[PDB]
A paper describes a structure:
Crystals of the purified complex were obtained and diffracted to 3.1 Å. Analysis of the diffraction data indicated that the asymmetric unit contained one molecule of NM-02 in complex with one molecule HER2-ECD. NM-02 forms a classical (variable-type) Ig-like fold, comprising of nine β-strands. The second disulphide bond (Cys50–Cys112) covalently links framework 2 to CDR3, which itself exhibits an α-helical structure between residues Thr112A–Trp118 (IMGT numbering). Inspection of protein quaternary structure, reveals that NM-02 is bound to domains I and II of HER2-ECD. Assuming a classic topology, whereby domain IV is membrane proximal and precedes the transmembrane domain, this positions NM-02 within a potentially more accessible, membrane distal epitope. Notably, this is distinct from the binding sites for the anti-HER2 therapeutic antibodies Pertuzumab and Trastuzumab, which corroborates both the applied selection criteria and obtained biochemical data. A total of 21 residues from domains I and II of HER2-ECD, comprise the epitope (defined as < 5 Å from NM-02) and is composed entirely of loop regions. The complimentary surface of NM-02 includes a number of acidic residues (including Glu111A and Asp115), with the carboxylate sidechain of Glu111A forming a salt bridge with the guanidino moiety of Arg217 from HER2-ECD. Overall, NM-02 buries 637 Å2 of surface area from bulk solvent upon complex formation and this is consistent with a mean surface area of 768.5 ± 201.0 Å2, as determined for this class of antibody.
Numbering used by the authors:
A (entry chain AAA): 24 to 122, 133 to 334, 337 to 541
B (entry chain BBB): 3 to 123
Write the structure that this text describes.
């Protein structure tokens, strides 16, 4: 039911050939989208029959550079706009048409009736109608501060006007079913949302987007959190305090706040806190901890020095690992952040006077065993056939994913194979390996055993054909169980067919 | 649940009685009021009565329209005498207390409230 979103924006997919597949994996069977629902750079043919289940988007809905005419987001009731496109808009619809004409024609957001924070930006798309027919301030929440709306009607077609059955001639479509239902501006008592004109028809104070009845069970969407079908303001805390002394005792009614729903325990690859929350980055003056059975938590901390990757501390704005900053990972056995290798890395920049990065400097990462964020590689030294410097890397969490989708990204590399012999799991997100001319031993890795949730998979294309690998004799050594291996020889096997010999198999 | 009754086609100069019926409530300490919206013209407050029976009207209706809140049957009446075609439109009753946001006429139009008035000559 609940699924991660994305964070690409106007940035253009490197593998258009698999781009749609990623979205299907992300949004198939998904009712609530944690983070942003980004739909970008789709063709006319494209079937989006997976988006039909989507109901909430805690992020910001972006529909940009799409030659499709239909985007079925009928069931979408609420956009919380926790994050905003350009920090100002909760819904952005940009450049959908131009070089049967192509482009978005109807928005058909017939169930959207709530935008808690953030405005609406619609511009640059000719086929679109029913963009100025909608009363946006009824969908905008009462306390919503960001109530900005910049819309562009500039078109190249005629708009068949709303059904006469659409009160106020306010509609998403010509159809009788696409009439905009109001649930704020037409209420009395002043109560934010209602299902009728009288105050006795007001929705409970803890509902959002409307309701079917007075009580808090009846809400179309909960404004704050969902307490097993009820909408509470906070979830029940895990701690109760002795009336007299204030001795913290755990109460059995306690629930962690994941997204906008109270949960007994967090989902996988998510951190439980003493503050009664599920999160991906731990609060300040806090350290990450592992449990008896691997369960990662978050204890308060004197707090130990630790290795920050990209998207953390000073490496928040840093684009990728470079010669100027490669030295920091010295001895790091775990980087708290993302590792992103770019052409500019090994090429260097003379305008900053950051020299090139030599292939021996990558030796540093021999120590490194876990990455909280993600590993992205669109560059490498052609010197190296494989990823040996990351032979030690046991797990990529992907708590921060690249473009919000991909844990592991390998594109445009002159390398023979991988060799991540230690890589036993990928915590969250999808694997994007493409346009790697020489890459073999790809179908040899059992990626079905590196993934943890079904929204995950590997997306490969423009590699070296396995037909060629087998033909040039590049396959798994006979001492690698079920021929699962990361590269050539017994120095790569996953499970050894017979007993160890340290590095090598025998 | 408030409903409007008493509309119809009539020749001008005739009379109509309008009923603002309820399904629960008490209008006590909550002065009621009739509104009306003519085709492609602004929503107007035609008449309103206090909790104590101190009536108000607009300049076009006074001496022709008399408003009155029955306590027993718990229904608000609006007697419209000396009807003119300039009157024609849809008349919505609604507590001046429980006032909407998108506009009284506009909101009650959404929920399908009020009753239709038609006047020829
Ligand atoms: C909030 O979370 C709850 C988790 O339970 C969502 O599920 C809803 O659960 C209630 C009962 O707690 C369902 O109502 C009734 O449940 C019984 C079974 O106990 C069922 O036989 C009845 O027909 C009735 O549905 C409610 O329908 C159910 N909704 C689902 C599964 O979609 C709840 O929907 C979440 N969201 C909100 C805004 O409440
Ligand atoms: C896909 O697009 C092409 C564009 O030429 C079109 O001919 C084709 O009919 C489309 N597919 C379907 C099933 O309509």
């Amino acid at each position: 039911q609940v699924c991660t979103g994305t964070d690409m924006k106007l940035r253009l997919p490197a593998s258009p050939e698999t781009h749609l597949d990623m979205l299907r994996h992300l949004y198939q069977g998904c009712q609530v989208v944690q983070g942003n629902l980004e739909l970008t750079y789709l063709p006319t043919n494209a079937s989006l029959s997976f988006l039909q289940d989507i109901q909430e988007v805690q992020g910001y809905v972006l529909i940009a550079h799409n030659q499709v005419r239909q985007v079925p987001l009928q069931r979408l009731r609420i956009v919380r706009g926790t994050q905003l496109f350009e920090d100002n808009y909760a819904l952005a619809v940009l450049d959908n048409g131009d070089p049967s004409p192509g482009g978005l024609r109807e928005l058909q957001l017939r169930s959207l009736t709530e935008i808690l924070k953030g405005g609406v930006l619609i511009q640059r798309n000719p086929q679109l109608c029913y963009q100025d027919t909608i009363l946006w301030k009824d969908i905008f929440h009462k306390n919503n501060q960001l109530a900005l709306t910049l819309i562009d009607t500039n078109r190249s077609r005629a708009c068949h006007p709303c059904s006469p059955m659409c009160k106020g001639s306010r509609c998403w479509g010509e159809s009788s079913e696409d009439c905009q239902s109001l649930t704020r501006t037409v209420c009395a008592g002043g109560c934010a949302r209602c299902k009728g004109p009288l105050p006795t028809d007001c929705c409970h104070e803890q509902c959002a987007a409307g309701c079917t009845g007075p009580k808090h069970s009846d809400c179309l969407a909960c404004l704050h959190f969902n307490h097993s079908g009820i909408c509470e303001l906070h979830c029940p805390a895990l701690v109760t305090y002795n009336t007299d002394t204030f001795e913290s005792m755990p109460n059995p009614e306690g629930r962690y706040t994941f997204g906008a729903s109270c949960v007994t325990a967090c989902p996988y690859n998510y951190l439980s806190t003493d503050v009664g929350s599920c999160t991906l980055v731990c609060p300040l003056h806090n350290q990450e901890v592992t449990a008896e059975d691997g369960t990662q938590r978050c204890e308060k901390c004197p707090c130990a020095r630790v290795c920050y990757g990209l998207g953390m501390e000073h490496l928040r704005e840093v684009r990728a690992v470079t010669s100027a900053n490669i030295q920091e990972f010295a001895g790091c056995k775990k980087i708290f952040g993302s590792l992103a290798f770019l052409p500019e890395s090994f090429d260097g920049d003379p305008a900053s006077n950051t020299a090139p990065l030599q292939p021996e400097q990558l030796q540093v990462f021999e120590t490194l065993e876990e990455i909280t964020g993600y590993l992205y590689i669109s560059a490498w030294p052609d010197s190296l056939p494989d990823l040996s410097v990351f032979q030690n890397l046991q797990v990529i969490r992907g708590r921060i994913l690249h473009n919000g989708a991909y844990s592991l990204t390998l594109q445009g590399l002159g390398i023979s194979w991988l060799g991540l012999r230690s890589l036993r799991e990928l915590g969250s997100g999808l694997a994007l390996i493409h346009h790697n001319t020489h890459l073999c031993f790809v179908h040899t890795v059992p990626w079905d055993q590196l993934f943890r949730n079904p929204h995950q998979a590997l997306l490969h294309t423009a590699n070296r054909p396995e037909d060629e690998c087998v033909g040039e004799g590049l396959a798994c050594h006979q001492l690698c169980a079920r021929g699962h291996c990361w590269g050539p020889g017994p120095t790569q096997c996953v499970n050894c067919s017979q007993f160890l010999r340290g590095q090598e198999c025998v | 649940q408030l409903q409007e009754s008493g509309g119809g086609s009539v020749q001008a100069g005739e009379t109509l009685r309008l009923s603002c019926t309820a399904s629960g409530f008490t209008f006590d300490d909550s002065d009621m009021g009739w509104y009306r919206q003519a085709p492609g013209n602004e929503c107007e407050l035609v008449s309103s009565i206090s909790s104590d029976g101190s009536t108000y009207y607009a300049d076009s209706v006074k001496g022709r329209f008399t408003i009155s809140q029955d306590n027993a049957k718990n229904t608000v009446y609006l007697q419209m005498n000396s009807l003119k075609p300039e009157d024609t439109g849809v008349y919505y009753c609604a507590a001046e207390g429980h006032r909407y946001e998108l506009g009284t006429c506009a909101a009650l139009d959404y929920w399908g409230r009020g009753t239709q008035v038609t006047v020829s000559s």
